[PDB]
Design an enzyme around this catalytic site. Structure first.
Site, PDB file in Angstrom:
ATOM      1  N   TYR A  26      13.457  94.792  69.209  1.00 26.24           N
ATOM      2  CA  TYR A  26      13.810  95.558  68.166  1.00 26.24           C
ATOM      3  C   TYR A  26      15.379  95.773  67.624  1.00 26.24           C
ATOM      4  O   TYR A  26      15.955  95.499  68.609  1.00 26.24           O
ATOM      5  CB  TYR A  26      13.371  97.289  68.216  1.00 26.24           C
ATOM      6  CG  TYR A  26      14.410  98.378  69.649  1.00 26.24           C
ATOM      7  CD1 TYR A  26      14.278  97.656  70.579  1.00 26.24           C
ATOM      8  CD2 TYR A  26      15.536  98.431  68.619  1.00 26.24           C
ATOM      9  CE1 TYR A  26      14.962  98.081  71.573  1.00 26.24           C
ATOM     10  CE2 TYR A  26      15.913  99.222  69.918  1.00 26.24           C
ATOM     11  CZ  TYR A  26      16.031  99.120  71.156  1.00 26.24           C
ATOM     12  OH  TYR A  26      16.682  99.634  72.195  1.00 26.24           O
ATOM     13  N   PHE A  36      22.541  99.974  64.490  1.00 22.21           N
ATOM     14  CA  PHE A  36      23.201 100.677  65.092  1.00 22.21           C
ATOM     15  C   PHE A  36      22.400 100.661  66.810  1.00 22.21           C
ATOM     16  O   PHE A  36      22.822 101.023  67.982  1.00 22.21           O
ATOM     17  CB  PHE A  36      22.740 102.334  64.720  1.00 22.21           C
ATOM     18  CG  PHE A  36      21.088 102.322  64.849  1.00 22.21           C
ATOM     19  CD1 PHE A  36      20.743 102.794  66.167  1.00 22.21           C
ATOM     20  CD2 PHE A  36      20.876 102.800  63.361  1.00 22.21           C
ATOM     21  CE1 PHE A  36      19.107 102.275  66.200  1.00 22.21           C
ATOM     22  CE2 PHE A  36      19.552 103.216  63.024  1.00 22.21           C
ATOM     23  CZ  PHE A  36      18.632 102.781  64.468  1.00 22.21           C
ATOM     24  N   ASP A  37      21.173  99.670  66.725  1.00 20.15           N
ATOM     25  CA  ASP A  37      21.120  99.272  68.480  1.00 20.15           C
ATOM     26  C   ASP A  37      19.291  97.905  67.771  1.00 20.15           C
ATOM     27  O   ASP A  37      19.332  97.537  66.790  1.00 20.15           O
ATOM     28  CB  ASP A  37      19.965 100.585  69.228  1.00 20.15           C
ATOM     29  CG  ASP A  37      19.506 100.218  70.555  1.00 20.15           C
ATOM     30  OD1 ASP A  37      20.232  99.843  71.032  1.00 20.15           O
ATOM     31  OD2 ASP A  37      18.929 101.343  70.796  1.00 20.15           O
ATOM     32  N   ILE A  56      11.046 107.909  69.731  1.00 24.27           N
ATOM     33  CA  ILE A  56      10.884 108.862  68.562  1.00 24.27           C
ATOM     34  C   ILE A  56      10.050 108.696  68.083  1.00 24.27           C
ATOM     35  O   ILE A  56       9.100 108.123  68.169  1.00 24.27           O
ATOM     36  CB  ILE A  56      12.003 108.751  66.967  1.00 24.27           C
ATOM     37  CG1 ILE A  56      11.839 107.148  67.076  1.00 24.27           C
ATOM     38  CG2 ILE A  56      13.533 108.749  67.541  1.00 24.27           C
ATOM     39  CD1 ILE A  56      12.543 106.928  65.768  1.00 24.27           C
ATOM     40  N   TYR A  82      15.595 111.323  64.120  1.00 24.94           N
ATOM     41  CA  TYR A  82      16.449 112.833  65.094  1.00 24.94           C
ATOM     42  C   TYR A  82      16.941 114.023  63.897  1.00 24.94           C
ATOM     43  O   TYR A  82      17.957 114.532  64.580  1.00 24.94           O
ATOM     44  CB  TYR A  82      17.408 111.553  65.441  1.00 24.94           C
ATOM     45  CG  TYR A  82      17.748 111.256  66.080  1.00 24.94           C
ATOM     46  CD1 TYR A  82      17.261 110.777  67.273  1.00 24.94           C
ATOM     47  CD2 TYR A  82      17.085 109.184  65.617  1.00 24.94           C
ATOM     48  CE1 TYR A  82      17.073 110.083  68.064  1.00 24.94           C
ATOM     49  CE2 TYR A  82      17.542 107.860  66.720  1.00 24.94           C
ATOM     50  CZ  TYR A  82      17.701 108.436  67.663  1.00 24.94           C
ATOM     51  OH  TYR A  82      17.090 107.653  69.056  1.00 24.94           O
ATOM     52  N   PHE A  99      13.325  99.582  61.381  1.00 22.36           N
ATOM     53  CA  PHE A  99      13.207  99.313  62.878  1.00 22.36           C
ATOM     54  C   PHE A  99      12.278  98.218  62.206  1.00 22.36           C
ATOM     55  O   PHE A  99      11.581  97.680  61.793  1.00 22.36           O
ATOM     56  CB  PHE A  99      12.627  99.919  64.078  1.00 22.36           C
ATOM     57  CG  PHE A  99      13.446 100.816  64.334  1.00 22.36           C
ATOM     58  CD1 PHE A  99      13.371 102.378  63.976  1.00 22.36           C
ATOM     59  CD2 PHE A  99      13.924 101.037  65.166  1.00 22.36           C
ATOM     60  CE1 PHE A  99      14.192 103.507  64.519  1.00 22.36           C
ATOM     61  CE2 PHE A  99      15.001 101.853  65.952  1.00 22.36           C
ATOM     62  CZ  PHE A  99      15.101 102.971  65.312  1.00 22.36           C
TER      63      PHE A  99
END
Length: 107
Positions: A26, A36-37, A56, A82, A99
């Site tokens: 991902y 961010f990731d 999430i 979030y 994502f």
């Protein structure tokens, strides 16, 4: 909620069930494209158990709609991510997340 848009199709047949371990690559991005990731940056597929709520909500319900092999864009509202707090320093308050997820296999 979560919107699931196919990037490349999977087998169209094998969908993850609660209790199964899902193995994915991902990348997570904010609305402006800022990453961010990413598991791809680690060159390490990420595993999580469907229904454990260790990802999430948008992932729980979104990846459940994917078939093995499929790559999809998941667009996730803040209430499914979030929420009002966000994750200060990383994710703003009330942030919609995007994502890119590839479902590699089930374990």
């Amino acid at each position: 909620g979560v919107q699931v848009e196919t990037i490349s199709p999977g087998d169209g047949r094998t969908f993850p069930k609660r209790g199964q371990t899902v193995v994915v690559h991902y990348t997570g991005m904010l609305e402006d494209g800022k990453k961010f990731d990413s598991s791809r940056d680690r060159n390490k597929p990420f595993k999580f158990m469907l229904g454990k709520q260790e990802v999430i909500r948008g992932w729980e319900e979104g990846v459940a709609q994917m078939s093995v092999g499929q790559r999809a864009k998941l667009t996730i509202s803040p209430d499914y991510a979030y929420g009002a707090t966000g994750v200060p320093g990383i994710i703003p308050p009330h942030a919609t997340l995007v994502f890119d997820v590839e479902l590699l296999k089930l374990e």
